[PDB]
Design a protein around this ligand. Structure first.
Ligand code: POZ
Ligand code: HEM
Length: 442
């Protein structure tokens, strides 16, 4: 009564290679050949069970940690975030920590993000896109805007002086590269590891200097930044976060937002600039050609409904995180099947977002589409572990789109839209394809 396995033919290596080259075509094949949305594969002799039937998402996102656990599956992050941070911490602390973070997105806070976001976007553009026309690599530039823009929202002035975006990005890169996606399924002292520690330590040292400089300061002077937020925070037992933990959280917050948003921004701009999608590009300008130079939280939140769809449909068609997993601590029901204890249960936004019923014509970028199966869209996950940076990411991306398409027009050099590059653990467009020509207006 367990879900149908997929033929192996190579015990030394599971479906690893097939999945790595193209996991969409591969997964759809499985789900197609076995006549079942729920199926099990073997990655290096380890049963990975995939809930690929959107109707059955709740069976994956609903179970509590005691039954379904991410900790063992997400071990690989521990080196990046810290030896005692989320997924490296007992869930009670983990959850506890993640909440502090969430309280940093009170949207009591967004009040000042729009002006900041636009301040960095306009600056970058007026710094890199000067000429009346020119060629840039969209993916690399959005990455710059993302990090730059994110720091201008969460990092205080004093911190940004010591740690600027350009520099912070290098640190993330240094440690995030330490990551081998394969490990997640298959549990070293590589040059990548070393760089990762130093980078986080460096970041550590600095954050230590700033705090010291803040605590010596007295006694007022207005809205505290992310770090300050984390520093104030106190546990359920009544103890303040250790810096090592505090650092980890910041890495986490920044790490998680860097690629997912960078990619989402890119895909969005790509589709939107494509001549085939003139329909929606126009519909977009129709929505932003009314806004003033200085945008405010209100109009980005409440006055850009079609732009949100653009971002959502981007994440829908090409989800940055193609799947999420958990260790099955106890046998869990799923459809007519049963997932045995020991399995790595996983749910794939990539797969689900391409189910014919939930999203007819999956490969078609349609911003006005809606899930034909409730719960089908899981770009930001769901249940207890539903993404926390959603509201922020969306705000961050939407505002960028508004500032970019307002002052520049774009043109995709390549005939069609970039192919997804499935080799990175966070998935976006290839970037050997992202070459774009911009044209300043007036
Ligand atoms: C073929 C051999 C080789 C050759 C080259 O082909 N090859 N080629 C290609 N692949 C290959 C490629 C990819 C993969 N992976 C397997 C690992 N998967 C994976 C996905 C997500 C993941 O995330 C862990 C948590 C998820 C939530 C999040 C991130 N987050 C949330 N919001 C913002 N960020 C998070 C949450 C809370 C938080 F607080 C912080 C957080 F970060 O981190 C962990 C792992 C991805 C696919 C495997 C192999 C190869 O092996
Ligand atoms: C498009 C942008 C983002 C996407 C697509 C995204 C996607 C996700 C997904 C799919 C998950 C579920 C992970 C899992 O189920 O295993 C998740 C969780 C999470 N993400 Fe995001 N996320 C995004 C942005 C962010 C940002 C900006 C942050 C930080 C501010 C962030 C922080 C988190 C956190 C804290 C969780 C909770 C993980 C947990 O509770 O265990 N995410 N995100």
């Amino acid at each position: 009564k367990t879900p149908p396995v997929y033929p192996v033919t190579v015990p030394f290596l599971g479906h690893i290679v097939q999945f790595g080259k193209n996991p969409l075509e591969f997964m759809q094949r499985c789900k197609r050949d076995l006549k079942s949305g729920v199926f099990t594969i073997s990655i290096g002799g380890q049963r990975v069970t995939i809930v690929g039937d959107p109707h059955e998402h709740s069976r994956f996102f609903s179970p509590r940690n005691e039954i379904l656990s991410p900790r063992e599956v997400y071990t690989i992050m521990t080196p990046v975030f810290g030896e005692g941070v989320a997924y490296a911490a007992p869930y009670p602390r983990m959850r506890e920590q993640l909440n502090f973070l969430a309280e940093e997105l009170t949207i009591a806070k967004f009040q000042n993000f729009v002006p900041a976001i636009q301040h960095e976007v306009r600056k970058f553009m007026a710094e890199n896109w000067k000429e009346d026309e020119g060629v840039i690599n969209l993916l690399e530039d959005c990455g710059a805007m993302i990090i730059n823009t994110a720091c201008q929202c969460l990092f205080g002035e004093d911190l940004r002086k010591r740690l600027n975006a350009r520099h912070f990005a290098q640190l993330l890169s240094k440690m995030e590269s330490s990551l081998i996606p394969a490990a997640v399924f298959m549990p070293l002292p590589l040059p990548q590891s070393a760089r990762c520690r130093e980078a986080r330590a460096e970041l550590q040292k600095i954050l230590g200097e700033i705090i010291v400089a803040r605590e010596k300061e007295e006694a007022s002077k207005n809205t505290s930044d992310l770090l300050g937020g984390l520093l104030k925070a106190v546990y359920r037992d009544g103890t303040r976060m250790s810096l090592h933990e505090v650092c980890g959280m910041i890495v986490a917050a920044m790490f998680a937002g860097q690629h997912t948003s960078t990619i989402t921004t890119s895909w969005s701009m790509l589709h939107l600039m494509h001549p085939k999608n003139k329909k929606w590009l126009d519909k977009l300008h129709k929505e932003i050609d009314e806004f003033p130079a200085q945008l405010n939280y209100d109009n980005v939140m409440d006055e850009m409904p079609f732009a949100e769809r653009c971002v959502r449909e981007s994440i829908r068609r090409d989800p940055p995180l193609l799947m999420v997993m958990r260790m099955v601590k106890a046998e869990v029901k799923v459809g007519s099947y049963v997932v045995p204890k020991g399995d790595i249960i996983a749910c794939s936004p990539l797969l689900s977002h391409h189910d014919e019923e939930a999203f007819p014509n999956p490969r078609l970028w349609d911003p006005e589409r809606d899930e034909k199966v409730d719960g089908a869209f899981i770009g930001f996950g769901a249940g207890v572990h539903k993404c926390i940076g959603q509201k922020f990411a969306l705000l961050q991306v939407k505002t960028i789109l508004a500032t970019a398409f307002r002052e520049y027009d774009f043109q995709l050099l390549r005939d069609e839209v970039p192919d997804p590059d499935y080799h990175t653990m966070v998935v976006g467009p290839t970037l050997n394809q992202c070459l774009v020509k911009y044209t300043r207006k007036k």
